[PDB]
Short mmCIF file of C-alpha atoms and ligand atoms in Angstrom, two decimals:
data_model
loop_
_atom_site.label_atom_id
_atom_site.label_comp_id
_atom_site.label_asym_id
_atom_site.label_seq_id
_atom_site.Cartn_x
_atom_site.Cartn_y
_atom_site.Cartn_z
CA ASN A 1 -57.01 -81.72 -96.56
CA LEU A 2 -57.10 -84.48 -93.94
CA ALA A 3 -59.93 -86.94 -93.44
CA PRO A 4 -61.48 -87.53 -90.01
CA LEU A 5 -59.91 -90.35 -88.09
CA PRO A 6 -61.77 -93.65 -88.16
CA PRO A 7 -62.70 -95.02 -84.73
CA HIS A 8 -60.34 -97.98 -84.95
CA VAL A 9 -57.13 -95.97 -85.44
CA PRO A 10 -55.06 -95.14 -82.35
CA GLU A 11 -54.01 -91.48 -82.57
CA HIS A 12 -50.45 -92.49 -81.78
CA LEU A 13 -50.34 -94.28 -85.16
CA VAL A 14 -51.19 -91.11 -87.07
CA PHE A 15 -48.51 -89.78 -89.41
CA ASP A 16 -49.86 -87.51 -92.14
CA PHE A 17 -47.83 -88.51 -95.21
CA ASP A 18 -49.11 -87.26 -98.59
CA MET A 19 -47.80 -89.81 -101.12
CA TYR A 20 -48.57 -87.25 -103.87
CA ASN A 21 -46.82 -84.35 -102.21
CA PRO A 22 -44.43 -85.38 -99.47
CA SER A 23 -42.82 -82.64 -97.44
CA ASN A 24 -39.11 -82.66 -98.28
CA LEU A 25 -39.63 -83.30 -102.00
CA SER A 26 -36.87 -80.75 -102.57
CA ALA A 27 -34.30 -83.16 -101.14
CA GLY A 28 -35.26 -85.87 -103.66
CA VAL A 29 -38.17 -88.33 -103.86
CA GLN A 30 -36.53 -91.36 -102.19
CA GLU A 31 -35.32 -89.00 -99.41
CA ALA A 32 -38.83 -87.52 -98.98
CA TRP A 33 -40.32 -91.00 -98.49
CA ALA A 34 -37.52 -92.15 -96.18
CA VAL A 35 -38.94 -89.81 -93.52
CA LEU A 36 -41.32 -92.69 -92.76
CA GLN A 37 -38.36 -94.76 -91.60
CA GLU A 38 -37.15 -92.30 -88.98
CA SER A 39 -36.99 -93.46 -85.36
CA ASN A 40 -40.04 -91.37 -84.45
CA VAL A 41 -42.21 -93.33 -86.91
CA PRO A 42 -44.04 -96.51 -85.99
CA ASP A 43 -43.68 -99.47 -88.38
CA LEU A 44 -47.28 -99.08 -89.48
CA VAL A 45 -48.98 -95.72 -89.51
CA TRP A 46 -52.22 -94.18 -90.65
CA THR A 47 -52.22 -91.04 -92.78
CA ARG A 48 -55.27 -88.81 -93.05
CA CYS A 49 -54.26 -87.58 -96.50
CA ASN A 50 -55.79 -88.94 -99.69
CA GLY A 51 -58.81 -90.01 -97.67
CA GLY A 52 -57.07 -92.03 -94.94
CA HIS A 53 -55.01 -95.21 -95.36
CA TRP A 54 -52.37 -97.35 -93.67
CA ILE A 55 -48.71 -97.36 -94.80
CA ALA A 56 -46.31 -100.18 -93.90
CA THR A 57 -42.84 -98.60 -93.48
CA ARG A 58 -40.47 -101.54 -93.15
CA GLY A 59 -39.36 -104.15 -95.64
CA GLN A 60 -40.38 -107.01 -93.36
CA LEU A 61 -43.98 -105.81 -93.24
CA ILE A 62 -44.19 -104.93 -96.94
CA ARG A 63 -43.06 -108.40 -97.96
CA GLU A 64 -45.36 -110.14 -95.52
CA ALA A 65 -48.33 -108.10 -96.75
CA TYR A 66 -47.34 -108.89 -100.33
CA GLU A 67 -47.21 -112.59 -99.63
CA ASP A 68 -50.57 -112.56 -97.82
CA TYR A 69 -53.12 -112.13 -100.63
CA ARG A 70 -55.81 -113.72 -98.44
CA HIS A 71 -55.94 -110.61 -96.23
CA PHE A 72 -54.37 -108.02 -98.51
CA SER A 73 -56.23 -108.06 -101.81
CA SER A 74 -55.16 -106.52 -105.11
CA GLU A 75 -58.80 -105.67 -105.86
CA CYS A 76 -58.20 -102.03 -104.92
CA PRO A 77 -54.45 -101.45 -105.23
CA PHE A 78 -54.20 -97.70 -105.65
CA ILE A 79 -54.92 -94.80 -103.37
CA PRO A 80 -57.08 -92.81 -103.36
CA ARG A 81 -59.90 -95.36 -103.21
CA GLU A 82 -61.65 -93.99 -106.28
CA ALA A 83 -58.46 -94.63 -108.28
CA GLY A 84 -58.09 -98.12 -106.81
CA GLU A 85 -61.82 -98.54 -107.46
CA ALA A 86 -61.71 -97.44 -111.07
CA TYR A 87 -58.80 -99.68 -111.82
CA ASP A 88 -59.47 -103.02 -113.26
CA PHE A 89 -56.20 -103.83 -115.03
CA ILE A 90 -55.27 -107.48 -115.40
CA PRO A 91 -53.48 -109.24 -113.86
CA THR A 92 -52.94 -106.49 -111.28
CA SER A 93 -56.48 -106.20 -109.91
CA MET A 94 -56.73 -109.95 -109.39
CA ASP A 95 -55.64 -112.36 -106.64
CA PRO A 96 -54.51 -115.96 -107.14
CA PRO A 97 -55.63 -118.42 -108.30
CA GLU A 98 -57.38 -116.40 -111.00
CA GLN A 99 -54.37 -114.11 -111.55
CA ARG A 100 -52.15 -117.03 -112.61
CA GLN A 101 -53.80 -117.63 -116.01
CA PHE A 102 -53.66 -114.00 -117.09
CA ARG A 103 -50.08 -113.76 -115.81
CA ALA A 104 -49.08 -116.76 -117.88
CA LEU A 105 -50.33 -114.94 -120.99
CA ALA A 106 -48.75 -111.55 -120.24
CA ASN A 107 -45.53 -113.48 -119.77
CA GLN A 108 -45.83 -114.76 -123.34
CA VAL A 109 -45.64 -111.15 -124.45
CA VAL A 110 -42.99 -109.48 -122.25
CA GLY A 111 -40.99 -112.38 -120.88
CA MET A 112 -37.38 -113.45 -121.24
CA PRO A 113 -37.71 -115.01 -124.71
CA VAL A 114 -39.10 -111.73 -126.09
CA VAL A 115 -36.30 -109.63 -124.65
CA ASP A 116 -33.81 -112.03 -126.19
CA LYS A 117 -35.50 -111.54 -129.55
CA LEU A 118 -35.56 -107.75 -129.15
CA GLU A 119 -32.02 -107.38 -127.86
CA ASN A 120 -30.42 -106.15 -131.08
CA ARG A 121 -33.11 -103.52 -131.55
CA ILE A 122 -32.63 -102.29 -127.97
CA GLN A 123 -28.89 -101.98 -128.62
CA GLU A 124 -29.56 -100.43 -132.01
CA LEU A 125 -31.87 -97.73 -130.71
CA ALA A 126 -29.65 -96.88 -127.73
CA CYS A 127 -26.52 -96.46 -129.83
CA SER A 128 -28.40 -94.38 -132.36
CA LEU A 129 -29.98 -92.06 -129.82
CA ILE A 130 -26.73 -91.53 -127.93
CA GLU A 131 -24.62 -90.97 -131.05
CA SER A 132 -27.19 -88.40 -132.14
CA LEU A 133 -26.81 -86.51 -128.86
CA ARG A 134 -23.02 -86.81 -128.40
CA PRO A 135 -21.89 -83.92 -130.60
CA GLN A 136 -24.38 -81.45 -129.10
CA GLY A 137 -22.75 -81.27 -125.67
CA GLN A 138 -26.21 -80.93 -124.11
CA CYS A 139 -29.66 -82.51 -123.89
CA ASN A 140 -32.79 -82.70 -121.76
CA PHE A 141 -32.14 -86.39 -120.82
CA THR A 142 -35.79 -86.79 -119.86
CA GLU A 143 -37.19 -85.69 -123.24
CA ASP A 144 -34.11 -86.65 -125.27
CA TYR A 145 -33.43 -90.24 -124.20
CA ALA A 146 -35.32 -91.40 -121.12
CA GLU A 147 -38.64 -91.08 -123.00
CA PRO A 148 -37.89 -92.11 -126.59
CA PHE A 149 -35.66 -95.05 -125.67
CA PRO A 150 -38.05 -97.24 -123.69
CA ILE A 151 -41.13 -95.89 -125.44
CA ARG A 152 -40.09 -96.60 -129.00
CA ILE A 153 -39.09 -100.12 -127.95
CA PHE A 154 -42.54 -100.65 -126.47
CA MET A 155 -44.30 -99.12 -129.47
CA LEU A 156 -42.44 -101.59 -131.68
CA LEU A 157 -43.31 -104.54 -129.49
CA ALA A 158 -46.97 -103.53 -129.35
CA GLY A 159 -47.07 -102.61 -133.04
CA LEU A 160 -48.43 -99.13 -132.38
CA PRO A 161 -47.65 -95.96 -134.32
CA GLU A 162 -45.01 -93.64 -132.87
CA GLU A 163 -47.38 -90.83 -133.66
CA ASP A 164 -49.62 -91.86 -130.73
CA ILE A 165 -46.88 -91.32 -128.13
CA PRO A 166 -47.67 -87.82 -126.90
CA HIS A 167 -51.35 -88.62 -126.34
CA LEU A 168 -50.76 -91.97 -124.67
CA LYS A 169 -47.95 -90.66 -122.48
CA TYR A 170 -50.27 -87.95 -121.21
CA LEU A 171 -52.95 -90.39 -120.20
CA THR A 172 -50.40 -92.61 -118.50
CA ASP A 173 -48.93 -89.68 -116.55
CA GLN A 174 -52.43 -88.82 -115.33
CA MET A 175 -52.72 -92.29 -113.79
CA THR A 176 -49.51 -92.43 -111.74
CA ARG A 177 -48.87 -88.76 -111.07
CA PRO A 178 -52.33 -87.18 -111.28
CA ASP A 179 -52.40 -83.50 -112.13
CA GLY A 180 -55.99 -82.70 -111.22
CA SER A 181 -56.81 -82.17 -114.94
CA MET A 182 -58.93 -85.29 -115.44
CA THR A 183 -60.04 -87.99 -112.94
CA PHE A 184 -58.65 -91.53 -112.80
CA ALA A 185 -61.69 -93.06 -114.42
CA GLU A 186 -61.77 -90.34 -117.12
CA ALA A 187 -58.11 -91.13 -117.77
CA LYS A 188 -58.83 -94.84 -117.84
CA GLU A 189 -61.63 -94.30 -120.29
CA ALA A 190 -59.65 -92.24 -122.73
CA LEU A 191 -57.04 -94.99 -122.75
CA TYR A 192 -59.71 -97.59 -123.38
CA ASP A 193 -61.26 -95.57 -126.23
CA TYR A 194 -57.86 -95.80 -127.86
CA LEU A 195 -57.43 -99.53 -127.33
CA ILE A 196 -60.91 -100.86 -128.23
CA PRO A 197 -60.72 -100.36 -132.00
CA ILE A 198 -57.20 -101.76 -132.10
CA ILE A 199 -58.18 -104.90 -130.24
CA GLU A 200 -61.21 -105.51 -132.45
CA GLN A 201 -58.91 -105.11 -135.46
CA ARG A 202 -56.38 -107.60 -134.11
CA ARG A 203 -59.01 -110.22 -133.33
CA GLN A 204 -60.13 -110.21 -136.96
CA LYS A 205 -56.67 -109.89 -138.60
CA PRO A 206 -53.99 -110.89 -136.12
CA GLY A 207 -50.36 -109.88 -136.33
CA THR A 208 -47.24 -110.81 -134.36
CA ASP A 209 -47.34 -107.71 -132.11
CA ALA A 210 -48.04 -107.95 -128.36
CA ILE A 211 -51.63 -106.74 -128.73
CA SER A 212 -52.46 -109.43 -131.28
CA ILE A 213 -51.00 -112.14 -129.03
CA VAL A 214 -53.07 -110.89 -126.05
CA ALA A 215 -56.25 -110.32 -128.05
CA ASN A 216 -56.17 -113.88 -129.45
CA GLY A 217 -54.84 -115.70 -126.38
CA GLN A 218 -56.15 -118.57 -124.30
CA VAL A 219 -57.05 -118.30 -120.64
CA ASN A 220 -58.30 -121.35 -118.69
CA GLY A 221 -58.78 -123.41 -121.85
CA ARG A 222 -61.10 -120.82 -123.43
CA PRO A 223 -60.51 -117.62 -125.34
CA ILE A 224 -59.86 -114.29 -123.61
CA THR A 225 -62.72 -111.84 -123.99
CA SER A 226 -62.51 -108.40 -125.57
CA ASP A 227 -62.94 -106.76 -122.16
CA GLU A 228 -60.14 -108.84 -120.64
CA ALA A 229 -57.76 -108.09 -123.53
CA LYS A 230 -58.55 -104.41 -123.15
CA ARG A 231 -57.75 -104.66 -119.47
CA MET A 232 -54.47 -106.52 -119.92
CA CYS A 233 -53.36 -104.17 -122.72
CA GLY A 234 -54.11 -101.15 -120.55
CA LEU A 235 -51.56 -102.37 -118.00
CA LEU A 236 -48.92 -103.14 -120.62
CA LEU A 237 -49.26 -99.57 -121.82
CA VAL A 238 -48.65 -97.97 -118.43
CA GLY A 239 -45.74 -100.34 -117.82
CA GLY A 240 -44.16 -99.59 -121.20
CA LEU A 241 -44.65 -95.86 -121.04
CA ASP A 242 -44.22 -94.86 -117.40
CA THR A 243 -41.66 -97.07 -115.62
CA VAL A 244 -38.28 -97.39 -117.29
CA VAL A 245 -38.61 -93.80 -118.38
CA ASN A 246 -38.54 -92.45 -114.80
CA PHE A 247 -35.97 -94.92 -113.55
CA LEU A 248 -33.37 -93.89 -116.15
CA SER A 249 -33.65 -90.25 -115.13
CA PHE A 250 -32.96 -90.92 -111.43
CA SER A 251 -30.04 -93.12 -112.41
CA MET A 252 -28.65 -90.60 -114.89
CA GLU A 253 -29.08 -87.76 -112.37
CA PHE A 254 -26.95 -89.76 -109.92
CA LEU A 255 -24.29 -90.65 -112.50
CA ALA A 256 -24.10 -87.01 -113.59
CA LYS A 257 -23.24 -86.13 -109.96
CA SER A 258 -20.80 -88.93 -109.24
CA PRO A 259 -17.65 -89.15 -111.32
CA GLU A 260 -16.26 -92.02 -109.26
CA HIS A 261 -19.30 -94.20 -109.93
CA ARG A 262 -18.99 -93.57 -113.65
CA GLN A 263 -15.28 -94.45 -113.63
CA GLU A 264 -15.94 -97.59 -111.71
CA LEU A 265 -18.24 -98.88 -114.46
CA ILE A 266 -15.87 -97.81 -117.23
CA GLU A 267 -12.88 -99.70 -115.91
CA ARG A 268 -14.60 -102.75 -114.43
CA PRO A 269 -17.53 -103.41 -116.75
CA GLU A 270 -18.15 -106.76 -115.10
CA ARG A 271 -19.77 -104.64 -112.40
CA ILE A 272 -22.57 -103.25 -114.56
CA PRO A 273 -25.09 -105.97 -113.61
CA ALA A 274 -24.32 -105.45 -109.90
CA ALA A 275 -24.54 -101.66 -110.26
CA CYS A 276 -27.85 -102.11 -112.05
CA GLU A 277 -29.27 -103.92 -109.01
CA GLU A 278 -27.82 -101.28 -106.66
CA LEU A 279 -29.40 -98.44 -108.62
CA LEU A 280 -32.73 -100.32 -108.67
CA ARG A 281 -32.50 -100.46 -104.84
CA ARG A 282 -31.46 -96.79 -104.30
CA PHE A 283 -33.64 -95.24 -106.96
CA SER A 284 -36.69 -97.50 -106.43
CA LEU A 285 -39.81 -95.62 -107.51
CA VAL A 286 -43.13 -97.48 -107.20
CA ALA A 287 -45.65 -97.30 -104.37
CA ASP A 288 -48.97 -99.13 -104.53
CA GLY A 289 -51.05 -101.05 -101.97
CA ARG A 290 -53.75 -103.53 -101.06
CA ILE A 291 -57.25 -103.64 -99.57
CA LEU A 292 -58.27 -105.45 -96.40
CA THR A 293 -60.64 -108.32 -97.14
CA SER A 294 -61.50 -108.76 -93.46
CA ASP A 295 -60.78 -107.61 -89.92
CA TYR A 296 -57.21 -108.59 -89.23
CA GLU A 297 -54.60 -107.95 -86.62
CA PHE A 298 -51.25 -107.36 -88.26
CA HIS A 299 -48.18 -106.83 -86.06
CA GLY A 300 -50.42 -105.77 -83.18
CA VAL A 301 -52.45 -103.20 -85.15
CA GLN A 302 -56.14 -103.81 -85.85
CA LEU A 303 -56.95 -103.57 -89.53
CA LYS A 304 -60.58 -103.30 -90.60
CA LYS A 305 -62.18 -104.77 -93.73
CA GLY A 306 -62.06 -102.21 -96.54
CA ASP A 307 -59.11 -100.30 -95.10
CA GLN A 308 -56.51 -99.59 -97.80
CA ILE A 309 -52.80 -99.98 -96.99
CA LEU A 310 -49.92 -98.55 -99.06
CA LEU A 311 -47.03 -101.06 -99.19
CA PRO A 312 -44.32 -98.90 -100.81
CA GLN A 313 -42.10 -101.16 -102.91
CA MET A 314 -39.66 -98.23 -102.83
CA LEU A 315 -39.19 -98.49 -99.06
CA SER A 316 -37.92 -102.05 -98.58
CA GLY A 317 -34.51 -101.37 -100.03
CA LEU A 318 -34.13 -98.03 -98.25
CA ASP A 319 -34.79 -99.73 -94.90
CA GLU A 320 -31.69 -99.77 -92.72
CA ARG A 321 -32.65 -103.17 -91.30
CA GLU A 322 -32.36 -104.46 -94.88
CA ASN A 323 -29.35 -102.53 -96.18
CA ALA A 324 -26.61 -100.77 -94.16
CA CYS A 325 -26.23 -97.10 -95.16
CA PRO A 326 -29.28 -97.18 -97.43
CA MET A 327 -28.90 -93.77 -99.04
CA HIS A 328 -25.30 -94.56 -100.08
CA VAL A 329 -24.67 -96.10 -103.52
CA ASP A 330 -22.22 -99.00 -103.32
CA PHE A 331 -21.73 -101.22 -106.35
CA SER A 332 -19.90 -103.77 -104.27
CA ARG A 333 -22.57 -104.47 -101.61
CA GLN A 334 -22.51 -108.12 -100.56
CA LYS A 335 -26.32 -108.25 -100.77
CA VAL A 336 -28.59 -105.79 -102.55
CA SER A 337 -32.03 -106.20 -100.96
CA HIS A 338 -34.99 -104.61 -102.66
CA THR A 339 -38.56 -105.23 -103.81
CA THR A 340 -38.30 -102.78 -106.68
CA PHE A 341 -40.16 -105.12 -109.01
CA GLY A 342 -42.64 -106.09 -106.28
CA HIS A 343 -42.99 -109.24 -104.22
CA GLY A 344 -45.37 -112.17 -103.96
CA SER A 345 -47.57 -113.32 -106.84
CA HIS A 346 -47.53 -109.95 -108.58
CA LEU A 347 -43.79 -109.87 -109.32
CA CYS A 348 -43.10 -107.67 -112.33
CA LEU A 349 -43.28 -109.57 -115.58
CA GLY A 350 -41.48 -106.71 -117.31
CA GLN A 351 -38.41 -106.86 -115.10
CA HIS A 352 -36.24 -108.64 -117.69
CA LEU A 353 -37.03 -106.03 -120.29
CA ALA A 354 -36.42 -103.22 -117.79
CA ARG A 355 -33.04 -104.63 -116.77
CA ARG A 356 -31.97 -105.06 -120.39
CA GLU A 357 -32.84 -101.47 -121.13
CA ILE A 358 -30.92 -100.22 -118.10
CA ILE A 359 -27.76 -102.20 -118.69
CA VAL A 360 -27.71 -101.20 -122.37
CA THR A 361 -28.13 -97.53 -121.46
CA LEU A 362 -25.29 -97.56 -118.93
CA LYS A 363 -22.84 -99.46 -121.12
CA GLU A 364 -23.60 -97.41 -124.19
CA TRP A 365 -23.80 -93.99 -122.59
CA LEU A 366 -20.53 -94.38 -120.66
CA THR A 367 -18.82 -95.71 -123.79
CA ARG A 368 -19.55 -92.54 -125.76
CA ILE A 369 -20.04 -89.89 -123.07
CA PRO A 370 -17.89 -90.85 -120.09
CA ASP A 371 -17.91 -87.32 -118.71
CA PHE A 372 -20.99 -85.23 -118.15
CA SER A 373 -22.71 -83.21 -115.48
CA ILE A 374 -25.92 -81.42 -114.64
CA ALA A 375 -26.34 -78.05 -116.28
CA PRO A 376 -25.18 -75.11 -114.15
CA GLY A 377 -27.99 -73.54 -112.17
CA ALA A 378 -30.51 -76.21 -113.17
CA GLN A 379 -32.72 -77.26 -110.32
CA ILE A 380 -33.82 -80.89 -110.60
CA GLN A 381 -37.41 -81.47 -109.55
CA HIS A 382 -38.67 -84.90 -108.55
CA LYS A 383 -42.39 -85.78 -108.66
CA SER A 384 -44.17 -88.19 -106.31
CA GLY A 385 -47.01 -90.63 -106.95
CA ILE A 386 -47.69 -94.26 -107.73
CA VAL A 387 -44.62 -94.07 -109.96
CA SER A 388 -42.21 -91.24 -109.04
CA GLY A 389 -40.48 -89.15 -111.70
CA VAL A 390 -37.97 -86.48 -112.66
CA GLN A 391 -39.43 -83.33 -114.25
CA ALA A 392 -36.45 -82.58 -116.53
CA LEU A 393 -32.75 -83.42 -116.62
CA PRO A 394 -30.52 -80.79 -118.23
CA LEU A 395 -27.10 -82.37 -118.92
CA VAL A 396 -23.94 -80.74 -120.34
CA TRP A 397 -20.65 -82.16 -121.52
CA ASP A 398 -17.62 -81.31 -123.63
CA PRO A 399 -17.94 -82.92 -127.07
CA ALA A 400 -14.14 -83.08 -127.15
CA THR A 401 -14.24 -85.61 -124.31
CA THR A 402 -16.69 -87.87 -126.12
CA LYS A 403 -15.90 -90.97 -128.16
CA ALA A 404 -17.58 -91.94 -131.41
CA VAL A 405 -18.27 -95.59 -132.00
C1 LIG B 501 -38.06 -100.02 -113.74
C2 LIG B 501 -39.14 -100.52 -114.27
C3 LIG B 501 -40.33 -101.16 -113.56
C4 LIG B 501 -40.63 -101.25 -112.26
C5 LIG B 501 -39.85 -100.67 -111.06
C6 LIG B 501 -41.82 -102.07 -112.12
C7 LIG B 501 -42.45 -102.37 -110.95
C8 LIG B 501 -43.52 -103.23 -110.79
C9 LIG B 501 -44.19 -103.53 -109.54
C10 LIG B 501 -43.75 -102.96 -108.19
C11 LIG B 501 -45.13 -104.45 -109.82
C12 LIG B 501 -46.12 -105.16 -108.88
C13 LIG B 501 -47.27 -104.29 -108.41
C14 LIG B 501 -48.20 -104.86 -107.41
O1 LIG B 501 -47.80 -105.86 -106.79
O2 LIG B 501 -49.27 -104.21 -107.30
C15 LIG B 501 -45.19 -104.60 -111.26
C16 LIG B 501 -46.04 -105.48 -111.92
C17 LIG B 501 -46.10 -105.63 -113.28
N1 LIG B 501 -45.24 -105.02 -114.21
FE1 LIG B 501 -43.77 -103.76 -113.81
N2 LIG B 501 -42.22 -102.50 -113.38
C18 LIG B 501 -41.33 -101.95 -114.27
C19 LIG B 501 -41.38 -102.11 -115.66
C20 LIG B 501 -42.31 -102.86 -116.35
C21 LIG B 501 -42.36 -103.03 -117.80
C22 LIG B 501 -41.33 -102.41 -118.77
C23 LIG B 501 -43.44 -103.76 -118.08
C24 LIG B 501 -43.91 -104.34 -119.42
C25 LIG B 501 -44.54 -103.64 -120.35
C26 LIG B 501 -44.06 -104.12 -116.81
C27 LIG B 501 -45.14 -104.98 -116.65
C28 LIG B 501 -45.66 -105.43 -115.47
C29 LIG B 501 -46.77 -106.34 -115.31
C30 LIG B 501 -47.47 -107.05 -116.48
C31 LIG B 501 -47.00 -106.49 -114.01
C32 LIG B 501 -48.10 -107.33 -113.33
C33 LIG B 501 -47.77 -108.71 -112.85
C34 LIG B 501 -48.94 -109.45 -112.19
O3 LIG B 501 -49.84 -108.76 -111.66
O4 LIG B 501 -48.82 -110.66 -112.21
N3 LIG B 501 -43.36 -103.52 -115.78
N4 LIG B 501 -44.15 -103.93 -111.81
C1 LIG B 502 -53.63 -95.65 -110.14
C2 LIG B 502 -52.38 -96.44 -110.59
C3 LIG B 502 -51.73 -95.83 -111.84
C4 LIG B 502 -51.28 -96.92 -112.84
C5 LIG B 502 -50.22 -97.85 -112.23
C6 LIG B 502 -49.04 -98.11 -113.18
C7 LIG B 502 -48.54 -99.58 -113.11
O1 LIG B 502 -49.63 -100.39 -113.55
C8 LIG B 502 -47.80 -100.00 -114.40
N1 LIG B 502 -46.64 -100.94 -114.07
C9 LIG B 502 -45.80 -100.79 -112.99
C10 LIG B 502 -44.89 -101.81 -113.01
N2 LIG B 502 -45.18 -102.57 -114.04
C11 LIG B 502 -46.25 -102.05 -114.72
C12 LIG B 502 -48.15 -100.01 -111.68
C13 LIG B 502 -47.36 -99.15 -110.91
C14 LIG B 502 -46.99 -99.47 -109.61
C15 LIG B 502 -47.41 -100.68 -109.05
CL1 LIG B 502 -46.95 -101.09 -107.45
C16 LIG B 502 -48.19 -101.55 -109.80
C17 LIG B 502 -48.57 -101.23 -111.11
CL2 LIG B 502 -49.58 -102.35 -111.92
#
């Protein structure tokens, strides 16, 4: 289902990529996207899928676009347009200078100092979850660890009941990897119906949770409104529920297939941080975009006001001009170049938390379960969207090769 080509698009720039269902999805999600970086593909293409939109394919262009908020606005950051239209999360749907105030607040909640405070709990939950799995010689990593781990940490931070997980997770999944079961706005609404009462409650009787801090915060000398808190909290929710969860699965799928990479980390633990960055490059998973604010000629292509452009954060690090042998995992790369956490003014606030969660998982998993693999005859399915994911991750191991701590 392709849309008719707008008058301003040269037919030689057409490349029909479906960000929701790329063609060689079988090969893996990062591999499916990397088709865009083949020699036959121009740096900047137009796809007729998902209503028609530009896609920058090279790291240089993605970064430039990301820096350029004047021309590339966050007002409508998701494709298809109706999704980008319906989304009003803060600070994501704002451009500087306005963004800055909201950012400053969200930072209060997720930032470095918070992670530092939460460190022991992160370590505590990881150890507990792993130890619980160890003796079984088999899990569903996606349901068994990748979900509970990051989610429970978020739930704790946000001061929300664990019981709400299944419902929230569903709504979140609808936003990034739409199923066809709702509509973006419907999804957004359901999430907001959830949040409203909680916010009201935390305005009246504040706590120490993230929601309380956002609900009662200051923005540009005055108090945040109820609508604004709702909108910030909505973003925090998607970030907490849908990001780290998918990343861990890609990473774990790779480790399960590469004994030598596992060993490397076991013997030379000083490499973990470095390996964390490398995996963030190779298994990058986010793709969003921007909206043209005016007619603008970018790298010789004419962009028209209102055109949307996908600037796949995923792609920068997979770009050969950025990293030699992109698809190869090397923990000793001299320079790991990625924009996994974004670029420009919208740099991920939650990066510190995400990194802490990754490093803890690697260290702790390898400590206890040094030797594992994918279950025989299991076919791993990746899913594409705004955030890409792994459907399920059947792992097996010999309990006798594990180590209790
Ligand atoms: C592996 C994990 C994650 C990845 C790859 C990731 C990626 C990104 C990307 C690419 C952006 C910028 C989007 C844009 O420019 O439109 C973003 C922004 C953001 N992320 Fe994340 N994120 C992750 C985890 C988290 C977590 C755990 C949270 C916290 C709950 C979080 C909170 C945020 C916020 C608040 C922003 C908006 C910053 C702003 O607009 O100023 N993220 N993230
Ligand atoms: C229709 C869009 C579906 C919801 C987007 C999810 C997320 O907000 C959360 N998140 C992600 C990272 N941190 C929080 C995101 C994903 C990718 C990008 Cl590029 C930006 C944003 Cl805001």
